[PDB]
Design an enzyme around this catalytic site. Structure first.
Site, mmCIF file in Angstrom:
data_model
loop_
_atom_site.group_PDB
_atom_site.id
_atom_site.type_symbol
_atom_site.label_atom_id
_atom_site.label_comp_id
_atom_site.label_asym_id
_atom_site.label_seq_id
_atom_site.Cartn_x
_atom_site.Cartn_y
_atom_site.Cartn_z
ATOM 1 N N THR A 1 -7.256 2.605 0.760
ATOM 2 C CA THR A 1 -5.815 3.358 0.878
ATOM 3 C C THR A 1 -5.227 3.558 -0.204
ATOM 4 O OG1 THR A 1 -4.889 1.325 1.179
ATOM 5 C CG2 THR A 1 -6.013 2.247 3.296
ATOM 6 N N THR A 2 -4.592 2.605 -0.984
ATOM 7 C CA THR A 2 -3.866 2.591 -2.128
ATOM 8 C C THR A 2 -4.593 3.401 -2.985
ATOM 9 O OG1 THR A 2 -3.351 0.437 -1.573
ATOM 10 C CG2 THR A 2 -2.297 1.383 -3.764
ATOM 11 N N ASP B 1 -9.373 -3.566 8.814
ATOM 12 C CA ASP B 1 -10.303 -3.268 7.684
ATOM 13 C C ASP B 1 -11.932 -3.539 7.822
ATOM 14 O OD1 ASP B 1 -8.150 -3.049 6.205
ATOM 15 O OD2 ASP B 1 -7.993 -5.200 5.491
ATOM 16 N N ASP C 1 0.960 -1.240 -0.027
ATOM 17 C CA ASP C 1 0.169 0.008 -0.087
ATOM 18 C C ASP C 1 0.850 1.189 -0.077
ATOM 19 O OD1 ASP C 1 -2.620 1.344 0.375
ATOM 20 O OD2 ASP C 1 -1.620 2.002 2.101
#
Lengths: 509, 517, 508, 513
Positions: free
Chosen positions: C81-82, C382, C48
């Site tokens: 996120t990424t 998560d 990430d």
């Protein structure tokens, strides 16, 4: 020493002022676009601002001329309550304007004297551009609302301004005696959102004494006081305290109690329902005040202590030079109230209705402290717009008015003055360029249109920089209070000339 | 070791008076663009009478090193034309080198310049009149006291400041039998008032000392009683206190205070005024108990401050509590507490009519720099009237006196001839500089402007008219009401050729490799 | 005169685009993880962007802005996120061109900022509602959204823990935002993923009580934010050093105080005392603390003040810096306060139930080791976040950037109908979208170009008759194997990026 | 642009650099030059007066000084340096005014002001002379001839100078009586005393032998034809492929011309001026023998000016071809004479020629060339200095001295004008005094003595008097026996005055395409 003589120092008078212009003009207006603030002492640390005042600091200013304008900025920023980024590039424009012309050999003497009455030539036109708005109160409502979002716009609050645009005018709407920064009480407290920002109508103590003193007192007779109930201020009753022995701790403890009990009873001799102490209140007195049914607020905020005294119509203890002689505030209610997340002691029924306590509700303080800061800026205008309820068509419209005025005055005056005065009249027309260039629209279009508009003498039609077209100045909100421009039109039309006087510049560093 | 010879020296010599006098030439007159000073720490300030900016300049060159000295006595006695002499001393050298550029001795022409001064002097002596009188001189001084404060601090000055400035002088100017020097008159700057506001005082005025306003804040009489010693128990301006061993000693302690006051008072009461100037400070407590006693003191007075009120009153400071007389006290036709501005405490106003060895004009101010800029302006004009009131001699010029003396001295060089035929010609050429070179800084053209009052010299000589240094429509010295003391210009004539001769004096340039410090 | 800002803006947007580009390889699970030797000269291995972008970063302000923009998506959704890193340069690919093309920076901003809302609005068309009231559905959908992603490992067990902890602190059927504010994540060394469990009161650091009862039920929760100690010289015992009788007598000073200061602690009385760490103290007198617990008040010392801060709110134990601040209100009311050294290894005071505002949950994260604890946390985080997003966003959306391949078509289509100077922009705006799932089609391996081009037509057909299916890494329905995410991570990445891209345009 | 500004300075750079060392003037000062030329040509150079015209310079700004040199000499005959050296004085003021910031046009116009004010004073000082009487003619010739090559032969050359102008003299004063009327004919043989001023048209025509047109009733003709013959004018039917064919046509050529030269002899015209225009080559080389055989002076393609001297002075025109005899438009000469002094030298004198009260002809004679030179150049300026008086009379001084008198007195005008130019004229006014200083400058070491005093002294001698560079010492400079006619310097003033403002009239230099 190191003497910077005219040309070099003039180019040096240019280097900062002109380049300082670059950013503050880039940020000029809402569509004025930000400059990254690089903190060279603190990391590289980056900040992004629409304000030039913040720029004037982070990276410091060497250039004296620019160093001068930092005053002018702050001067205009603080005094006018607005025009921070404006008056600055205004000095950049004319110096830039004077560049080629003094590089055309034209004396600043020639220049300055030209822009002198040229500055004044705009005035009568400005004084004509004075548009009385706020003369009526419904006007004054919208008149305040006209300039309400105006100041906060370039003061870098783009979000909750609307919520404050409604709030700030209300506090100013009631004043009408004068624009008042004192009767109006300024509070900003965390809790709630920044659109939850609150207006307490009355005095407010953001203090809370809690139930340690009575929380609810109606028709409360206030003692506004500096009177120390531990420290025990002057008009002191006793001998000067002394320790001659190991066990001497007792008498000094007992001696102060009387001294405390005196000012308790003495202020219990006010009959006051609520005791407001700008100093603290010790255990012995506060348990006496609490047993007296009196709310004793300790270490109350200094200006608020007077604001309380003012807005509730009461008097302050005068450092207990008045034992009973201090007059008493009376407000129909003293109530500790939860607004937002926090309990504050709210005073309503205070003797001043024009007085308003704006309680700004922070979602965080970092915006909240910036909120009131920039919020206080419109108040200056608004307070002076209370005094002068007047307007000037913004968006570079009054510019284009004063442009032609001096632009013809150039051809009306002409001479070594119109040498300068045309250069002057260009900086007049350079202001409409920036906001349009900030808005990324064709200035020579919108200017020469607005020129043709003010060549047709239309100052009720101007550059409307929201959409960035040429359009009405009807007081759409695009119109400015007459206070700002005459103020903003001034110092740079001064300082630029003032900078043109310093030629030999001896820098002994 | 190095030796920079002659022209080499002269080259070095000229490298300053070219630009560093041009610093004045750029500053000539109010229309002369004024001089910013940025300090060793980078502190920006606007300057004129560039002996200021020359002292603020740090000298890398002997001429620069010298000029401050040469500029001083001009700014000392005259107070104005500090810009003129530096130009003029910087100018003629430029003509002078050009003559050694022609291959002429600095020796010869300087001589011919020295007396070129003299022949300009008498020619200058003709200009205006050498007598002005009290009612006469004031308004032209009130013009000068204006146009000094009207050019150099305010634009109109103020008929407060102008008149109060000439009157500060005229006060002691009459005391000194139609002379004065500065120390006799002192501008006291304090800000928070307005530039406009100037309190002309015959003596000391400083902030009074009280404790409680409920206890009397009062001056007694018009007289001051000056004390090094206590009017209130003397505390050598350091840590000193009172302490008690019992509740009753506390009671015993305060009557000590009140009786010592009375003790001190009764002495200082009977020997004249009551009113103390007491060098040392006392506790802010029994200070009101002295007020409560009576007849306030002044505590924490500066060591020299007691002396300032001492002799200027004509009296002294009382050196000892036991040594007491009105002579060792103050002599004042006025002493009264007066609030300075609305912003702070009463200044104790001592207007000393029993004597003044310093008549100290107080000045309020809006800002330090501008109340400075006033005080800046003042002492310049303070000294020109000082020239006048000493010997009342005025000269129409700065657009005139030059081109006046520029005419005849160069004309004289026709009747001079040889070594002085170039001198008194080129001498007056330096005269040709300033009024022209003034108009240089102005938007008007100096060459053009010169040609006019040149043509005027064909019309009229030693004229009441001239160029406009005020950059007006009229070009005069009279409709301008511009002038100097006929002293000053003559005094200004003294200095220019004085350094011209001065760079000549010895044959010795020989240096360690250091001709500069 | 505005040259340099463009140059700066170039320099900004360049190093802006730059740092955001490197992740576009590591973007996604098939995104390749970089072992990175750092300024420390030592390997660092992550996929990430955020961790990658932080763990080695120099200072470029726009780059510094993006690691925040990276962190933003994190601190915003805890999720997607990424993604936000990839869209910025994608947008800037349009912007820099448009800037080269000459579109005024203020325009492109309000162009894409207007066009933003149109994208997420068509996303709301793409959006598929799942039940935020039904814990099962959330247990079903979020885990499936987690099964659209890597970790079901402890999640499919800990989603029963995550969805519940959320469901327990879920008041509304909407389930609203629900930050983890009421979910206390604490570990315990010993135990299991099964010994990981939700607990209904606030587990306190160990239990630090010397003579303090091992359990006190119905706990007044005392808080000690003030020192237990008499003044120091060389110890809690104040020692003036010459001869030993003075330091023996000043004890009578010292001893009585720390006793009375404690006697004062038991005056108002406390069943539990919250005591933060003694280094979150100046120091705490054992002399007191001995006689403190010897007056029989159960205590936890050595607790984080932020625990206390978490505890001051969630169980409503109001901060006590002082003995006047000892009060039944500032002394929190616990239903039960115990310690469990057991059910695994390690000791913790268990508040089980309490007087608590906003429900409350603590999950005590256990396992055969710390790692089994650690990934369990990473299994819930998560789940913790995807739920609180999925509940924050009434509907659900399939993942893999296929909605963008839909939306890139959608907006460019309307960007025509939009017309205006921004038509060129708002197309290029949407055109920025498909590059990201392309990069995934490259990151999973495929033609990033061929496929996503065709998907725009696939997404012109059923809008999903195909999508980017990560395990397939290719043209597929992403509803046949669900590749699915809450609406936010889509919105989040978008709403962040434009703003982050917006001001830069307005940045000089 | 900068180029406009620099080039005028660059003009002032190259120009003013030249006009200065152009003063060593007079004096025995400075070491003699062997000048390797710009092409590498070694040349021994002296006497700046000719070194003026001699000088090879480049650039426009330098050559205008040669142009300036050429101007004064031909005008007066005197003061060749006087016009140039003051261009040093001019560009003195110019730069200083451009350094004063004075405008080029103002600096230009400043040239005219000082000029008017200058011609004022030079005439004010100058002492009037009579250009009719022999007296100041002799005297201005004297001092000029005293500054010319022969002081000794200044004697007989003087009446030959005085009578020459007095031959051509015009009523009272006027600018007239040029040197073109004067035909100076160098005669080899004789001496300088034998130099002869002849009243009439003399020619430099040099033809074969002697006794040839020495006769009486010998007219001097011009023929714009030449004589005929087969293979001269009339035809040849025979062609030459053969030397024998060459002979019979030349024989028939000679035999026919022999009849024609009789017709020129019976014309009364014993000098034909035979056209340089060549018919076959016109007058045959076979014919020249025959015309000379009749004592008629013709040399092949006679020198063209002689043709014009006979036109101008005598009024001769061509005639009909000698075949027709002559229309006798050949001017009236009852004597044309070939004089051999010492039995040598060729000089055609036309005596009894028509002369229009002018074309006086000095025949400058000598056995050497130097002898003829020393005469010829000396009488020339004596002719000139008298022509100077006639053109513009009186006298000022010489050697630059009276200009300092102008310089003192002009600064007074520079005092009166009260303009920028009053300074500009003034910046020039004393720039004039550089001349005697720079005249005395170039000879040596330990320099500075006399230079400023070369100026200072005159101002000490005030407005009438100053130092006389030729005799030394201070007096009224205009007569020390140091003079040049008032014409010479006022002729010197305007030219350099003119030429310099052109530099200011230059906006910028160029180069033609």
């Amino acid at each position: 020493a190191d003497e910077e003589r005219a040309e070099t120092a003039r180019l040096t008078s240019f280097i900062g002022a002109i380049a300082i212009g670059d950013l503050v003009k880039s940020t000029l207006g809402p569509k004025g676009m930000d400059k990254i603030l690089l903190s060279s002492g603190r990391d590289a640390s980056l900040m992004v601002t629409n304000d030039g005042a913040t720029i004037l600091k982070n990276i410091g200013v060497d250039n004296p001329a620019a160093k001068v304008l930092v005053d002018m900025s702050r001067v205009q920023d603080d005094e006018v309550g607005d025009g921070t980024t404006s008056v600055t590039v205004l000095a950049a424009e004319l110096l830039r304007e004077a560049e080629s012309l003094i590089a055309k050999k034209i004396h600043p003497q020639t220049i300055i004297a030209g822009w002198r009455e040229a500055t004044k030539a705009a005035r009568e036109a400005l004084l004509s551009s004075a548009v009385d708005h706020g003369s009526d109160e419904v006007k004054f409502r919208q008149d305040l609302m006209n300039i309400a979002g105006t100041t906060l716009s370039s003061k870098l609050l783009t979000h909750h301004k609307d919520h404050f645009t409604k709030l700030a005018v209300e506090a100013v709407l009631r004043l009408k005696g004068s624009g008042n920064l004192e009767a109006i009480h300024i509070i900003k407290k965390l809790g709630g959102s920044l659109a939850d920002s609150y207006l307490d109508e009355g005095f407010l103590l953001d203090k809370k004494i809690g139930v340690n003193q009575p929380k609810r007192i109606e028709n409360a007779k206030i003692l506004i006081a500096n009177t120390g109930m531990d420290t025990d201020k002057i008009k002191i009753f006793g001998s000067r305290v002394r320790v001659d022995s190991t066990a001497k701790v007792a008498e000094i403890e007992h001696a102060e109690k009387e001294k405390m009990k005196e000012k308790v009873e003495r202020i219990l001799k006010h009959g006051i329902n609520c005791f407001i102490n700008r100093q603290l209140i010790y255990n012995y007195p506060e348990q006496l005040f609490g047993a007296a049914g009196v709310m004793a607020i300790e270490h109350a905020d200094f200006a608020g202590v007077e604001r309380l005294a003012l807005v509730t119509g009461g008097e302050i203890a005068s450092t207990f030079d008045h034992p009973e002689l201090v007059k008493l505030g009376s407000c129909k209610l003293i109530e500790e109230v939860m607004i937002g997340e926090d309990k504050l002691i709210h005073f309503s029924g205070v003797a001043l209705g024009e007085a308003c306590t704006i309680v700004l509700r922070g979602a965080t303080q970092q915006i909240l402290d910036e909120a009131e800061r920039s919020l206080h800026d419109a108040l200056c205008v608004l307070a002076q717009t209370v005094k002068d309820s007047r307007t000037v068509y913004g968006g570079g419209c009054s510019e284009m008015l004063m442009a032609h005025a001096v632009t013809q005055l150039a051809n009306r005056t002409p001479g070594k003055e119109a040498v300068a005065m045309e250069s002057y009249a260009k900086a007049l027309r350079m202001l409409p360029t920036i906001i349009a260039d900030n808005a990324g629209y064709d200035s020579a279009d919108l200017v020469a249109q607005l020129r043709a508009a003010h060549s047709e003498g239309n100052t009720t039609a101007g550059l409307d920089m929201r959409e960035g077209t040429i359009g009405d100045m009807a007081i759409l909100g695009i119109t400015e209070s007459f206070q700002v421009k005459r103020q903003v039109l001034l110092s740079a039309a001064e300082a630029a000339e003032v900078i043109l006087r310093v030629d030999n510049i001896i820098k002994a560093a | 070791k190095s030796r920079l010879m002659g022209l080499e020296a002269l080259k070095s010599h000229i490298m300053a008076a070219k630009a560093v006098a041009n610093t004045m030439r750029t500053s000539l007159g109010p229309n002369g663009l004024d001089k910013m000073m940025v300090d060793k720490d980078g502190d920006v300030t606007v300057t004129n009478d560039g002996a200021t900016i020359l002292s603020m300049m740090d000298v890398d060159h002997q001429i620069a090193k010298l000029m401050v000295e040469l500029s001083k006595s001009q700014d000392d006695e005259i107070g104005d034309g500090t810009t003129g002499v530096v130009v003029l001393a910087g100018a003629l050298l430029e003509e002078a080198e050009q003559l050694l550029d022609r291959g002429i001795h600095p020796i010869r022409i300087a001589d011919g310049y020295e007396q070129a001064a003299r022949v300009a002097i008498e020619h200058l002596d003709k200009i205006s009149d050498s007598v002005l009188v009290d009612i006469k001189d004031t308004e032209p001084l009130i013009q000068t006291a204006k146009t000094t404060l009207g050019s150099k601090v305010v634009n109109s000055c103020h008929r407060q400041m102008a008149e109060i400035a000439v009157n500060a002088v005229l006060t002691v100017a009459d005391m000194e039998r139609r002379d004065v020097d500065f120390e006799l008159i002192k501008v006291e700057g304090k800000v928070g008032g307005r530039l406009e506001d100037t309190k002309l005082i015959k003596g000391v005025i400083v902030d009074k000392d009280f404790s409680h306003p409920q206890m009397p804040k009062k001056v007694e009489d018009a007289k001051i009683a000056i004390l090094t010693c206590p009017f209130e128990p003397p505390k050598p301006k350091t840590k000193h206190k009172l302490d008690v061993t019992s509740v009753e000693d506390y009671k015993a302690l305060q009557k000590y205070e009140k009786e010592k006051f009375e003790e001190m008072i009764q002495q200082i009461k009977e020997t004249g005024a009551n009113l103390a100037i007491c060098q040392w400070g006392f506790d802010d407590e029994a200070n009101h108990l002295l007020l409560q006693n009576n007849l306030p003191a002044v505590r924490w007075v500066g060591g020299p401050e007691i002396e300032l009120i001492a002799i200027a009153t004509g009296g002294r400071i009382v050196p000892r509590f036991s040594e007491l007389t009105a002579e060792k006290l103050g002599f004042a036709g006025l002493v009264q507490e007066i609030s300075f501005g609305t912003t702070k405490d009463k200044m104790l106003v001592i207007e000393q009519c029993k004597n003044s060895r310093a008549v100290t004009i107080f000045i309020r101010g809006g800002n330090k720099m501008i109340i400075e800029e006033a005080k800046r302006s003042l002492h310049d004009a303070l000294c020109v009237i000082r020239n006048l009131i000493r010997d009342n001699r005025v000269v129409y010029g700065g657009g005139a006196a030059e081109i006046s003396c520029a005419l005849a001295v160069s004309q004289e060089a026709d009747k001079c001839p040889t070594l002085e035929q170039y001198a008194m010609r080129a001498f007056a050429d330096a005269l040709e500089v300033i009024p022209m070179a003034l108009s240089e800084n102005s938007g008007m053209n100096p060459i053009q402007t010169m040609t006019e009052v040149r043509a005027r010299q064909v019309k009229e000589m030693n004229p009441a008219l001239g160029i406009d240094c005020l950059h007006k429509g009229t070009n005069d010295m009279k409709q301008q009401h511009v002038i100097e003391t006929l002293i000053g210009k003559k005094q200004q004539i003294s200095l220019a050729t004085q350094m011209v001769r001065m760079i000549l004096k010895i044959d010795d340039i020989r240096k360690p490799g250091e001709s500069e410090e | 005169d505005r040259d340099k800002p463009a140059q700066i803006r170039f320099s900004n947007i360049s190093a802006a685009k730059a740092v955001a580009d490197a992740i576009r390889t590591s973007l996604g699970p098939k995104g390749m993880d970089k072992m990175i030797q750092d300024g420390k000269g030592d390997v660092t291995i992550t996929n990430d962007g955020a961790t990658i972008l932080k763990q080695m970063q120099v200072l470029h302000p726009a780059a510094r802005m993006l690691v925040e923009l990276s962190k933003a998506q994190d601190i915003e959704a805890g999720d997607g996120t990424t993604s936000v890193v990839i869209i910025a340069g994608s947008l800037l690919d349009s912007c820099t061109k448009l800037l080269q093309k000459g579109i005024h920076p203020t325009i492109i901003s309000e162009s894409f900022q207007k066009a933003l809302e149109k994208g997420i609005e068509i996303l709301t068309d793409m959006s598929r509602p799942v039940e935020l009231s039904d814990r099962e559905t959330l247990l079903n959908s979020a885990t499936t959204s987690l099964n659209s992603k890597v970790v079901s490992q402890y999640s499919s067990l800990l989603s029963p823990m995550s969805v519940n902890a959320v469901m327990k602190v879920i008041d509304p059927a909407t389930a609203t935002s629900v930050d983890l504010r009421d979910i206390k994540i604490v570990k315990k060394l010993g135990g299991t993923i099964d010994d990981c469990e939700l607990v209904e009161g606030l587990v306190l650091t160990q239990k630090v009580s010397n003579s303090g009862i091992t359990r006190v039920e119905k706990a007044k929760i005392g808080l000690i934010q003030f020192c237990l100690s008499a003044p120091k010289t060389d110890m809690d015992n104040q020692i003036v050093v010459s001869d030993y009788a003075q330091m023996d007598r000043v004890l009578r000073e010292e001893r009585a105080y720390i006793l009375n200061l404690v006697k004062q602690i038991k005056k108002t009385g406390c069943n539990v005392l919250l005591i933060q760490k003694s280094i979150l103290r100046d120091a705490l007198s054992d002399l007191a603390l001995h006689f403190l617990n010897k007056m029989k008040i159960m205590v936890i010392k050595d607790i984080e003040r932020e625990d206390i801060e978490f505890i001051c709110k969630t169980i409503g134990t109001k901060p006590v810096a002082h003995i006047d601040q000892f009060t039944a209100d500032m002394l929190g009311s616990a239903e039960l306060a115990e310690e469990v050294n057991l059910n695994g290894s390690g000791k913790l005071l268990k508040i089980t139930g309490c007087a608590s505002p906003g429900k409350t949950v603590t999950i005590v994260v256990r396992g055969s080791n710390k790692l089994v604890i650690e990934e369990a946390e990473r299994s819930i985080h998560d789940a913790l976040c995807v739920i609180r997003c999925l509940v924050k966003k009434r509907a659900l959306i399939a993942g893999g950037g296929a909605p963008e391949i839909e939306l890139a078509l959608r907006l460019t289509e309307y960007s025509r109908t939009l017309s205006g100077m921004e038509s060129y922009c708002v197309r290029a705006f949407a055109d920025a979208m498909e590059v990201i799932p392309s990069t995934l089609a490259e990151n999973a391996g495929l033609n990033p170009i061929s496929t996503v081009t065709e998907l725009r037509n696939r997404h012109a057909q059923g809008e999903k008759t195909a999508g980017i299916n990560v395990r397939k890494g290719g043209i597929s329905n992403i509803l046949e194997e669900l590749v699915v995410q809450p609406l936010l991570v889509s919105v989040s990445a978008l709403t962040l990026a434009t703003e982050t891209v917006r001001s830069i345009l307005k940045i000089d």
